[model samples]
Target: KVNVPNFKLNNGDEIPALGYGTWLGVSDFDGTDIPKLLDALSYAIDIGYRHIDTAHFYRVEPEIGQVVQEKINEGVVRREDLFITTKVWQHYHRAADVEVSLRASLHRLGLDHVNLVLMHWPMSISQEGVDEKIDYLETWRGFEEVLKKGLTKAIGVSNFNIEQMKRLLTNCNVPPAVNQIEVNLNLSQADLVDYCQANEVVVVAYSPFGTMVPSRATLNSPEPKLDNPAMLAIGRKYGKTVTQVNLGYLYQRGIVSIPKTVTKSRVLENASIFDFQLDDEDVATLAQFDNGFRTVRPLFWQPYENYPFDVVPGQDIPIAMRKWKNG
Candidate 1:
């Protein structure tokens, strides 16, 4: 067991600073790969991963639930020993639907309650006869209710910008304990990370590797080779691989990183970042790689008023749109 360190959430609950991201094959929800996902998850748990991040939109909760149960039955881990986090999707932003979605998630997850639940996105998608979309503030109220009901031990948001976070903080009864967002070398959201840390809200970094690998790519750009001289030099100094350096850089900064991998070797490698530390000079050298780049921009969501990115509604599609059009 690696014994990964824990970071305390605002609610005083402890979360493993490094977590196994269950977003692999999440784009498709057909459940055809449930067995494969289960195998990967089981291996992850066997290798000392206690924190698992999943979402309702991923549609693998049932598969994840099965794996977790099996692990518990096998005496590999107990329900209390694991930190499970799931999210309510965009369509379920309504207050009534929030509970419905979470309950459904719990049913699929085969759990009485999850450790944490997050608003997957700040924006809401409206259905017919519901002319007015539910505001995120109202959706947060729903999250508060679930927290009170013990459906989730803690509640938070994802992909929310600083302004939205400020507004939410001002209006929310139970302040968010976590803000799940993209934070990697190439696209370090420094200001957002600082703000979240200052407010005592832990920032859970989703893609800590950035565009280094093709499978994890969010943008349509060429993959940045992991063997870059700068990264390699740092890795050699610590006797770690470039991947470990990438994760350690973020961990040193107090940001929780959840790098997704289904491969057994990679899963173990991702979790083995705790032995070494990154120096301030190494941190600055890695920080120079930031170019305000983002891999997960949803330009199709531009029309929504609460679209979290800086793009203008209907006008800014960014590089992702260009790649899709030209390719």
Candidate 2:
């Protein structure tokens, strides 16, 4: 059993260094005829996965909630013992809908409060589709109210770059306890990570394994090249898989990663990262593999004629030098 270390957030909540993600848990294909996620969640807790990452947008919150409640009842886990994190969906960004949306999420998850609640994304569109704004600062102010109302233990933002974070901090008194962003061997995101660290904002990495492997799109193809020589060489030294080494690199860097999967073996494989540590040179060599490929491309925003990060296909978006300007 791997004993995962905990990183304390700015607000003093302890988060496990690794978590099991609930993404696509609702999308089982090929007539698997099994509730793989419920099984995975039960198995994950049995094998010592203490942190569970889910979001309202994942559309499987009800099932995850059921499993969590059942596990708590079975005495396999306790509500207080687990570090549970969920995100507020993009559709509920408006101030009026914020509390209602959070309450709905809480009801769906069968929880009164979450350890951490995040703004799912920065951009918000009006109900009439007349105006679109990246009002993260305003939305964060509402989150502050949610915290005051005892809705969540801590609050943070997701999918926010450094520029957006700066604006949020400048406009609000309560700094974000954490920032969740896309990170992996290919998309290292060093600059943003450094800024968040300096600001006392914990950095949580999503898509740590470079997104779904068999997604079939050209941009999603080429499969992150995680099995490249450098990663394999590091894995050999620790007697780990390329995937374990990939996850270990992030764990060793103190970044909490939620690698999503429904496979029982893969979930167990990802949980085996705490057995070894990567040395400084191992960290550097693995860090050198950053190719800046973003796997989660939001094509819906393109119809609105906005590409926040110059998301042209097959190009390394130069995001490191981009200064903090506005949310």
Candidate 3:
């Protein structure tokens, strides 16, 4: 079992630095089986993962909840020994709807409360046929309400840019405890990470491998080769795989990483990152891999206000979305 370290949140809560991500079915659930996912999660907990990251958008909370409860009942883990995280989905971003969404998630997870709850996205989708806007600042008020009600121990935001984070910080009563964003060798948001860390907001990195797989490549962008000669050389020195080296880079930066894999072997491989350390020279070499790329850009929401990425209005719709318009 790996002895993973912990990062203290601004709210005085601690989160395991390495976590198991439950977004495996985010892109394609029809191909994924629940029993398999349950088995993978059970195996992960049996090994040494204490932090489990999930979101309502993933639609696998019930399966994840089942595995968690089974582990607790079997005396493999206690409720306090685990840290559970879930997020509010985009459609329910209204201040009033936030608590309702969380309650629904709690029901699905079969838990009275979660460790942390996050606002899934910085932008809020307007209600169908309603012309008025729903401000995220107002949505934040709803997050504060649930925190007070003890539905969650801490509250935070996700996919929020620095500007959005600053605005929320300025207007909110409760400061955000975390800002979960995409950070990896290929897409390191360095400035944003520095800003959040300086302000006491823990940064959680999702999609920490970037577009290392060809199937996840973005238009006009090359896939990141995880087996690059430098990374392989570094791995050889540490007696680890390239994947563990990649995770070690993030760990050295004091950021939290949640790499998703449903295969039990890969899950065990992901957890093995805690045993190695990368020197400064190796970290500097890995820093050269950053190309400011993102694998999960939701340009479908660009027509809405507060789209987070840097894109020209007329020129930046993703190719897949543009194809739908022309057809």
Candidate 4:
């Protein structure tokens, strides 16, 4: 088991610096693959990943709950030692359904409560239609209610742009404890991180590597690959892989990263990043990769009033969103 540092959330609960992500993208899931994912997550636990990130959309809570419970049975780790983060997806953003979503997630996970819970996205669309009156502030009140019920130790948001976060900070009864967003070498989200850190909201990042892998890259994606000269140099300095250096940069910035992978070796490799630190010069080199590239852009929601993505100053409609809109 590797020792990892913990970040103290505003609510006075601690979250591990690194976490294991259970999402494998929607198209990747099939009924047959759950066992493979189960085995991989089981190995992740054996290797000391106490923070497990999952969501209702992932549809893997049963497998995750089974593995965690099995680990508990073996006395490897207890419920109190683990930090589980779940989310209330868009369909359940109704003020009345926030707790309802969490209860369903808890039932699937076989747990009394989760360590942290987040609004999966800022958009407020449900089965029937858009109710302009039901925005996040109303949804957040339900978050407060769930917290009161001891349903989750910390409550937060995900994929919220800076403006939305600002509005939430100003108007929330229980200030959001964390904001999980896409933070990768390409889209470092420096300003967002700075603002959230200063305001006491811990930033949790998903898709931490972004489109570093060739198959996942978009035609317009300009992120540097692992073999990029600067990335290789930074890894060389610390005798680490480019992957480790990438994750380390985020950790050094006081952010929590949940990197997803089922490859056993890759899971072990991702956790081995805690032993090294980067210099200011190397950090600046890494920072230069930020070009506002997002891997998880849900352009389908671009038409909504509460959609959280900011429009680029000169371009009113992002090309991808335009394509999605036209289709």
Query: What are the Cα lDDT values of the candidates?
Result: 0.83, 0.76, 0.82, 0.84
Mind giving the per-residue lDDT tens digits that candidate 3 earns over 51-121? Answer: 99998877778878888999999999999999999998666777888899999899999999999999987
Cα distance off (Å), candidate 2, residue 71 = 0.6
Q: Model 2 off-target regions past 4 Å?
A: 25-34, 126-130, 211-226, 303-308, 311-327
Ranking by TM-score: 4, 3, 1, 2
Q: Which candidate, 1 or 3, has the higher lDDT?
A: 1
In order of appearance, the predictions have TM-scores of 0.91, 0.87, 0.91, 0.92
Put down candidate 4 lDDT per residue, 1-327, tens digits, no spaces: 777789999989999999989875545344456667778788888888899999887778877998999999999889999999999866677788999989989988999999999998887765444535478998999999999999999899998888999999999888998999999988888899999999999999999989886657767677588678888888888999988998999999999999988788888899988888798899888888888877877655667778778654432332321221100
The digit string of per-residue lDDT tens for model 2 on 1-327 reads 657789999987889999888766323212252278779888888888888888766666777888889889999889998888888765577766678878877888889888888987776754344335647777787788888888888899888888888878788878888899888877888999889988888889998877424442355454446546777788889999888988888887778999877788988898888888798888888767677778676654443322345555543212211111110
Candidates ranked by lDDT, best first?
4, 1, 3, 2
Please give the distance, in angstroms, between residue 163's alpha carbon in candidate 2 and its true position after superposition: 0.7
Supply the TM-score for candidate 1: 0.91
Q: What CA RMSD would candidate 2 show?
A: 6.5
Which 10-residue window of candidate 4 scores lowest in summed lDDT? 318-327
Which stretches of model 4 miss by more than 4 angstroms? 28-32, 128-133, 311-327
Instruction: List the lowest-lDDT window of 10 residues for candidate 1.
Output: 318-327
State in Å the error of residue 231, model 2.
Answer: 2.0
Candidate whose lDDT is highest: 4
Off by over 4 Å in 3: 25-31, 126-132, 214-223, 315-327
